[PDB]
Design a protein around this ligand. Sequence first.
Ligand SMILES: [Mg+2]
Ligand SMILES: [Mg+2]
Ligand SMILES: [Mg+2]
Ligand SMILES: [Mg+2]
Ligand SMILES: [Mg+2]
Ligand SMILES: [Mg+2]
Ligand SMILES: [Mg+2]
Ligand SMILES: [Mg+2]
Ligand SMILES: [Mg+2]
Ligand SMILES: [Mg+2]
Ligand SMILES: [Mg+2]
Ligand SMILES: [Mg+2]
Ligand SMILES: [Mg+2]
Ligand SMILES: [Mg+2]
Ligand SMILES: [Mg+2]
Ligand SMILES: [Mg+2]
Ligand SMILES: [Mg+2]
Ligand SMILES: [Mg+2]
Ligand SMILES: [Mg+2]
Ligand SMILES: [Mg+2]
Ligand SMILES: [Mg+2]
Ligand SMILES: [Mg+2]
Ligand SMILES: [Mg+2]
Ligand SMILES: [Mg+2]
Ligand SMILES: [Mg+2]
Ligand SMILES: [Mg+2]
Ligand SMILES: [Mg+2]
Ligand SMILES: [Mg+2]
Ligand SMILES: [Mg+2]
Ligand SMILES: [Mg+2]
Ligand SMILES: [Mg+2]
Ligand SMILES: [Mg+2]
Ligand SMILES: [Mg+2]
Ligand SMILES: [Mg+2]
Ligand SMILES: [Mg+2]
Ligand SMILES: [Mg+2]
Ligand SMILES: [Mg+2]
Ligand SMILES: [Mg+2]
Ligand SMILES: [Mg+2]
Ligand SMILES: [Mg+2]
Ligand SMILES: [Mg+2]
Ligand SMILES: [Mg+2]
Ligand SMILES: [Mg+2]
Lengths: 116, 136, 52, 66, 177, 188, 75
Amino acid sequence: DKKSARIRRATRARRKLQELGATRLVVHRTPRHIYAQVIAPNGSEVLVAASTVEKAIAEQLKYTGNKDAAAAVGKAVAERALEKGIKDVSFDRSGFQYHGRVQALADAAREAGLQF
Amino acid sequence: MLQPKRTKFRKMHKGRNRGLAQGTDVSFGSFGLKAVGRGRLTARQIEAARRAMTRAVKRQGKIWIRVFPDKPITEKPLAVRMGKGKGNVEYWVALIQPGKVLYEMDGVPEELAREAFKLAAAKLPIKTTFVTKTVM
Amino acid sequence: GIREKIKLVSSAGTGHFYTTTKNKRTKPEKLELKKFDPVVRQHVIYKEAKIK
Amino acid sequence: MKKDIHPKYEEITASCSCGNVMKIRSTVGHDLNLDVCSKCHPFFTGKQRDVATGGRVDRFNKRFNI
Amino acid sequence: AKLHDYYKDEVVKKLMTEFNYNSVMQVPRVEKITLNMGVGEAIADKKLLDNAAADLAAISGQKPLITKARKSVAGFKIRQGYPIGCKVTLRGERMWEFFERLITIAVPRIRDFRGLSAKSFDGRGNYSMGVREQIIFPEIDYDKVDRVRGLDITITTTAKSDEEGRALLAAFDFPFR
Amino acid sequence: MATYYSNDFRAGLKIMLDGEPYAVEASEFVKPGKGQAFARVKLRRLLTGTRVEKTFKSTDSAEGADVVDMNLTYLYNDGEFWHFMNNETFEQLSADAKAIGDNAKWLLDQAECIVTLWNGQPISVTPPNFVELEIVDTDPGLKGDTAGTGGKPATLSTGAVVKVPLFVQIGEVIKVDTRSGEYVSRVK
Amino acid sequence: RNGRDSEAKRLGVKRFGGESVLAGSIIVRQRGTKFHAGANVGCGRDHTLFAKADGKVKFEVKGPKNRKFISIEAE
RNA sequence: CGACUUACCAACCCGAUGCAAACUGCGAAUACCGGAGAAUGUUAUCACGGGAGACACACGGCGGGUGCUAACGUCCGUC
RNA sequence: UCCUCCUAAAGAGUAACGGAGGAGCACGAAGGUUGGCUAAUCCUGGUCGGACAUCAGGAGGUUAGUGCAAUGGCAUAAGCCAGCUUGACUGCGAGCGUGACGGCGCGAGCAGGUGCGAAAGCAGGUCAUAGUGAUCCGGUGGUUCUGAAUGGAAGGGCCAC
RNA sequence: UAGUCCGGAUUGGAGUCUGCAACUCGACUCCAUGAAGUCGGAAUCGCUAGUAAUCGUGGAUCAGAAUGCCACGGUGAAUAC
RNA sequence: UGCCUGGCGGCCGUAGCGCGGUGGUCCCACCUGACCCCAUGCCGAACUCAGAAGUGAAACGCCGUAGCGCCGAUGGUAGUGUGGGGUCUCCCCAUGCGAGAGUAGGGAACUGCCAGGCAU
RNA sequence: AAUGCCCC
RNA sequence: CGGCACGUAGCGCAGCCUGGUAGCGCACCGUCAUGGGGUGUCGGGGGUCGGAGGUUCAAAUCCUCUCGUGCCGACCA
Ligand SMILES: [Mg+2]
Ligand SMILES: [Mg+2]
Ligand SMILES: [Mg+2]
Ligand SMILES: [Mg+2]
Ligand SMILES: [Mg+2]
Ligand SMILES: [Mg+2]
Ligand SMILES: [Mg+2]
Ligand SMILES: [Mg+2]
Ligand SMILES: [Mg+2]
Ligand SMILES: [Mg+2]
Ligand SMILES: [Mg+2]
Ligand SMILES: [Mg+2]
Ligand SMILES: [Mg+2]
Ligand SMILES: [Mg+2]
Ligand SMILES: [Mg+2]
Ligand SMILES: [Mg+2]
Ligand SMILES: [Mg+2]
Ligand SMILES: [Mg+2]
Ligand SMILES: [Mg+2]
Ligand SMILES: [Mg+2]
Ligand SMILES: [Mg+2]
Ligand SMILES: [Mg+2]
Ligand SMILES: [Mg+2]
Ligand SMILES: [Mg+2]
Ligand SMILES: [Mg+2]
Ligand SMILES: [Mg+2]
Ligand SMILES: [Mg+2]
Ligand SMILES: [Mg+2]
Ligand SMILES: [Mg+2]
Ligand SMILES: [Mg+2]
Ligand SMILES: [Mg+2]
Ligand SMILES: [Mg+2]
Ligand SMILES: [Mg+2]
Ligand SMILES: [Mg+2]
Ligand SMILES: [Mg+2]
Ligand SMILES: [Mg+2]
Ligand SMILES: [Mg+2]
Ligand SMILES: [Mg+2]
Ligand SMILES: [Mg+2]
Ligand SMILES: [Mg+2]
Ligand SMILES: [Mg+2]
Ligand SMILES: [Mg+2]
Ligand SMILES: [Mg+2]
């Protein structure tokens, strides 16, 4: 039910983003992995997804659940988005504290170009 | 003398008494006294009918009182003008619609129940009738 | 009716002032806040004072 | 564990009359002398002497008889 | 940590062969030992509560949390929000150190120890017990102390029933009986 | 200072009629057949402490006053003034000779005595009903030929004089009722 | 000891379903959020749902709790 | 200090039966708001200006409060 | 005089010396923001301790709570806890609601200048509805706007008890 | 200078003796237990010298059963205007 | 493409509970450890951080099951608009609308985007 | 030269 | 009828305003004094607020309803 706790933590900001109709960048941090994907303002369709389950990153990395891996997948997702033409998003920490791995992903994305 | 132990509010609107009745099935006992008319029974009339029927069966069998006076009826005093707030509660009443079974009884033969209900109904302002239990 | 009203005079040298109420009994210490002062269009500290 | 909040907590030696030495971390500060530890307490050879049931007719016939 | 190593090496396999467990994760393991000292006299004297807190910080290795009146009860002239207790949670190496200290020093030192109950077990395995004098812990000295306090221990386990919790403490040769 | 009307105030109110605080003790409202209504109030002058009788007109009326009473505790006397304090606000306060009239001999120290203050200022203090006091002076009682009880005059550490039975000597604390000025017991 | 009612507050729905609406016009006046705000509509400090764009009012029943939603179809 | 017997009362739950203007896990007919269309209607609609009167109503039907489901009673809504 | 429910006839409104209750405030945090948390009550085990304190677990599910009456609402919590703060800002205001009128209420958005947040953003008081008194007359501070020949001033005006 | 190495009441256990017989109801001994009591309210009592105060001893009664009663000595005062 | 698993939805109980069974290659969860980032009104419990020895026990997912919950009739049985009538406090007739509860039954959800393993 | 009542 | 102000130990009264303790006098119990009774002295005990329901953490106290006892008038017709 830690799941339900953090989902309740996320729900408010998620619905505010829903209402503002902004393209939101969501993360989802597990112990052994970290994910990211930008989802169209309607919320049902996803634009680009970058994850540390992908071989293209899992090979370059040494351990998957740590801050440098988070920065790597953040770089990956911001690059894929900017290539697809998306450059203005909003960050949806999806319940996790904006700190450590998630903050690292966010800084890497900001650095790679995603204005938010 | 039946009367609610507590009520949320002391006085109640007059209201109307339209429609048929709800508890129109003899369920508990084997015979019942179904009302055919329509009006309002009082706690006094209910108690009088109960006394009549229980004495007629001589403390035998089991009876049920399927109605309960919850409506508080109020009256103004005498020689008082017509304004100046609602009255004050005098007695309690149970509105009756056609078909509402009033009393129930089992454990006594059918004819003895007939007589007991006759002696009871002779003290009720509503026209009533005897009804028996039915399957389904 | 225990809650008197006060004026928060500006510390920007003007005579501008707001006006609110304070419970003089439980909070005897003066009220100091930073409110917008429109005569100089800055946020300056405001120090309370008597209505007079 | 915060820094200045909690008290000192160091490894302290505890010696009993059972002849058992025990290295324990505790707040006692100095060394420690025990009188009774777990292994010496009269708990497993005491459940009879700490009740003392006995029998009065036995006491009587031992006191005297026919 | 001596008792913890002992647990990991003997007790897990002993409980395995005892209860015919299939996964090692099934074996009951303790999680926290909670220490509580409810000082009702604190509303009369707060310095009493402070001294109780100090004694608890002595008995354990941690500063205690000052519990406060959840509700306002007139039967004891406590108003909601009053500081009336102390609490210490012990997890990990601190829990194991206090557990060892307890069952090896304090239980033998308690006055007229004829054994602890085998039926104070919450029905859910979690054991709890109480002491009547805080001097039974060698950390505090009876010439230094002024008032004799008490407290109660609470051994929370992941035992489904209480039979397996008691069997766990027995594997730890807890001195209850 | 909400103005009060005659057929409104019952006992307990502190009316302020004619630059002077009062205190309604009793009041009888009358509405006779065919005439203006009135109230016969049994007022109480709250400064000299005399009970005045006033028949008030339905219409005739008066403003209220800040006369209030609560439990102050005596501290000390200095010159012509008596100082007391609260146990729930700890607000300091000073009275005068007029307020403490004839209760000077009843208050010792730390006595918890109800005081009436008006305009945020005391006007009358009420000594606790029973006060423990010590006797400064007495004539060693000698029964002599007394056949009845006899009694004996005895000054106290605060100047007062009370009749004490016969045995109370000097340095014995007694208990007196401020209300009657009389001996109750010798507190051991 | 009675007869002290209060002034009627004129709550209720002001623009019903499928009704053209300029931005800033009240749709419902209420006490609590009996109707919640949806697309292009706001929620005042006293829970009056107003319009934030022009278009046609629509009433919805979306939600996991089966709540009532006011939305504006921006036409 | 422990207690043994048992003609009464019985909360909480479970089954069954009713009641409510200030009860609602349901819920119409009408009425009300908005849009579209044909026919009809001496613009019947709205705005601005000149002139008013009137603001004691009554009874009959329908929905009610009060009264006694009394009054050619009384107070409302609608015709 | 004002607020809440019913009467009130499923839009709004609707009377009676009809049925029930409340208000004439409180708060500089009980406001703003960011982060986090989820109750009442029962059962069991537990030092004094007990019907009921504090501790632990379980069942339960918002029967709890909301500064204050009742109604509607509240879990994204509007409830509870903590950090930083003063948006309890100034000038306006598309457009609506509600009034015979005096008026009263809601409000996105613009400009200046702040607060919290990494940011998206939120903030011109408080879950909402009671907590109030028109005009005259006069007081206080500001302000060149006027100032009875002229320069001042008195006194008026404009802005904020 | 402490409810104490004061006080010994009460109670548990174990015994001795007298006596047909120590349960109701003896006395004494041993071990343990260690109440109240920190100089005593109004009132009240005895005593003028080997007296009061204090310390022991014996006897009658009597198998056993006295802190009572009757005697004996040891130390030995204050005051009487 | 077929099945598995993650996230974000759509929908808001025919979608939820309960009982039985089952899942660890991957994913997930528990897990290991704690100087460092960070944290406890005490507690690495939680929140974090550094990892991968063990386990699917708990949780989570999935399959089954009709003990509940839930849905629910075409269709048949109260009220009511309009007109008329009566024995008029309450009903009837013509006409239009037509429930609530209950019955038969249904029911162990359906689906969109993008991501990781066997066949192809 | 304070008080001091009564006894079927 | 209303309004209204009472109901607290055996009796008579306080308290209540401004919530957290129930007080005062007489009486009552046991000594003492006395030949004995009384006066007197020394000590002791006793109630929980007519009742019920609310507000509250908590009600003698605050609200509301009941029961009982007093007081005022229930007039112009
Ligand atoms: Mg009926
Ligand atoms: Mg202001
Ligand atoms: Mg458990
Ligand atoms: Mg209804
Ligand atoms: Mg209507
Ligand atoms: Mg025309
Ligand atoms: Mg006109
Ligand atoms: Mg009319
Ligand atoms: Mg009649
Ligand atoms: Mg309406
Ligand atoms: Mg009208
Ligand atoms: Mg009022
Ligand atoms: Mg939040
Ligand atoms: Mg308990
Ligand atoms: Mg509730
Ligand atoms: Mg808030
Ligand atoms: Mg406008
Ligand atoms: Mg509010
Ligand atoms: Mg005027
Ligand atoms: Mg004038
Ligand atoms: Mg002026
Ligand atoms: Mg000029
Ligand atoms: Mg001039
Ligand atoms: Mg001027
Ligand atoms: Mg001594
Ligand atoms: Mg002898
Ligand atoms: Mg003692
Ligand atoms: Mg003599
Ligand atoms: Mg002589
Ligand atoms: Mg002698
Ligand atoms: Mg002798
Ligand atoms: Mg002899
Ligand atoms: Mg001698
Ligand atoms: Mg595995
Ligand atoms: Mg962890
Ligand atoms: Mg690995
Ligand atoms: Mg159904
Ligand atoms: Mg049908
Ligand atoms: Mg009809
Ligand atoms: Mg149906
Ligand atoms: Mg299932
Ligand atoms: Mg006589
Ligand atoms: Mg006349």
